[PDB]
């Protein structure tokens, strides 16, 4: 019922970079708030508590300000590891209540992908529907276009993609794109191409494959 | 310090009971000094508190939940437990358990889990569960290969490579929910193109909630 009022949602830092999240609940808290952090797929891990205190094992570099209705969670040299969601919460009356969450990106240098495609095997076939599956790997910006292309015609409507959270060492993501058909559709053509425009390519990657060669 | 070990089903009907358990490692569930919280996170919502139980029998639950909610600890097992009555859509989260210390200096009472388990997916349908079908992303200095996790409900999968032993290069993607109302993701993984002759790939397709395990070789042709 005392609601949390977090900002921003999102943020893009470079490693090292000073980092500010704030969070304002809508009546006086005195100290009783707590920061989190929640890294992908893994338990969320308290980092401050009682507005300023670290939390044993928490490295130093994570650091909590602020009391009543306005709280500071300053990271004060960002890792590649601090990639997670951060969320406040105030511990004064009951229910517990968390703010909606700041999402930390890692800015690093432009790293192009690289690409691979892959065909449908015979044993789906036999069901009646092809899956072809294009692989962007470890690039950076997230920012990709991903067109497909059967016997050069352009296809739309037919595709659905898929991005891996940023990696925890090298921040870097991958990407997958799958093109659904028929089987039918599938062999009324030859030519199968994925088409890769990203920042760091000076010019489009196409790889491609003929069916049955 | 603590370990907190989540089960229970993934698939639960609406209007039926949902009830999850926490086993506890490492401290007594019936120590005074601590609490048990149970908190949910609906797929790209927020996180919502539950309630917390203390063995004395002091419990609170949100009021929010309160009038479906009750929870309850066992000793025999050292583990404590949800539930959840009449459930619907928007029942569908990753639930969290999680330990708290109480110290009314720092905190309100029962209100600062400081442990948490790394939660589980309950996803309220009617539908049944299904198993996935695998295929093989063949091979066409570094070569990728991987397989094709098809048609799939509800989540998660889990994959691993050559039983556990090859994980660096992987990524398995997020499974996207395809048109059919069923799952599908791809896991894929580099490797070097000299190791392709000699080295055998097998990728492991693991599908609890229906009780599915699949193993898909992965060679060139």
């Known amino acids: 019922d005392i609601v949390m009022t977090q900002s921003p949602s999102s943020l893009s830092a470079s490693i090292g970079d000073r980092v500010t999240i704030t969070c304002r609940p809508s009546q006086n808290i005195r100290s009783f708030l707590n920061w989190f952090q929640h890294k992908p797929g893994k338990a969320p891990k308290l980092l401050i508590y009682?507005?300023?205190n670290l939390q044993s094992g928490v490295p130093s570099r994570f650091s909590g300000s602020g009391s009543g209705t306005e709280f500071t969670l300053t990271i004060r040299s960002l890792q590649p590891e601090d990639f997670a969601t951060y969320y406040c919460?105030?511990?004064?009356?009951?229910?517990?209540?968390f703010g909606q969450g700041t999402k930390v990106e890692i800015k690093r240098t432009v790293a192009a992908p690289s690409v691979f495609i892959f065909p449908p095997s015979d044993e789906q076939l036999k069901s009646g529907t092809a899956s072809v599956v294009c692989l962007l790997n470890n690039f950076y910006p997230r920012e990709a276009k991903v067109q497909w292309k059967v016997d050069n015609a352009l296809q739309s409507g037919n595709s659905q993609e898929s991005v891996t959270e940023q990696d925890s060492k090298d921040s870097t993501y991958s990407l997958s794109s799958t093109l659904t058909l028929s089987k039918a559709d599938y062999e009324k053509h030859k030519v199968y191409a994925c088409e890769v425009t990203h920042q760091g390519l000076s010019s489009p990657v196409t790889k491609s494959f003929n069916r049955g060669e | 310090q603590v370990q907190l070990e989540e089960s229970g089903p993934g698939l639960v009907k609406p209007s039926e009971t949902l009830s999850l358990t926490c086993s506890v490692s490492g401290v007594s569930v019936t120590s005074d000094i601590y609490y048990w919280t149970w908190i949910r996170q609906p797929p790209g919502k927020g996180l919502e508190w539950i309630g917390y139980?203390?063995?004395?029998?002091?419990?609170n639950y949100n009021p929010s939940l309160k009038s479906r909610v009750t929870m309850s600890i066992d000793t025999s097992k050292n583990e404590f437990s949800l539930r959840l009555t009449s459930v619907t859509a928007a029942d569908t989260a990753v639930y969290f358990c999680?330990?708290?210390?109480?110290?009314?200096?720092?905190?309100?009472?029962?209100?600062?889990?400081?442990?948490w388990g790394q939660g589980t997916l309950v996803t309220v349908s009617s539908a049944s569960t299904k198993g996935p079908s695998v295929f093989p992303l063949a091979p066409s200095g570094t070569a990728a290969l991987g397989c094709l996790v098809k048609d799939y409900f509800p989540e998660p999968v889990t994959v691993s490579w050559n039983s556990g032993a090859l994980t660096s290069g992987v990524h398995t993607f997020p499974a996207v929910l395809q048109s059919s109302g069923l799952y599908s993701l791809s896991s894929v993984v580099t490797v070097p193109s000299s190791s392709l002759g000699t080295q055998t790939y097998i990728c492991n397709v693991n599908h609890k909630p229906s009780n599915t395990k699949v193993d898909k070789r992965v060679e060139p042709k």
């Open positions: 139980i203390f063995y004395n029998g002091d419990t």
């Open positions: 919460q105030q511990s004064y009356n009951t229910p517990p209540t």
């Open positions: 999680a330990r708290g210390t109480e110290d009314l200096g720092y905190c309100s009472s029962g209100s600062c889990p400081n442990h």
């Open positions: 009682a507005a300023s």
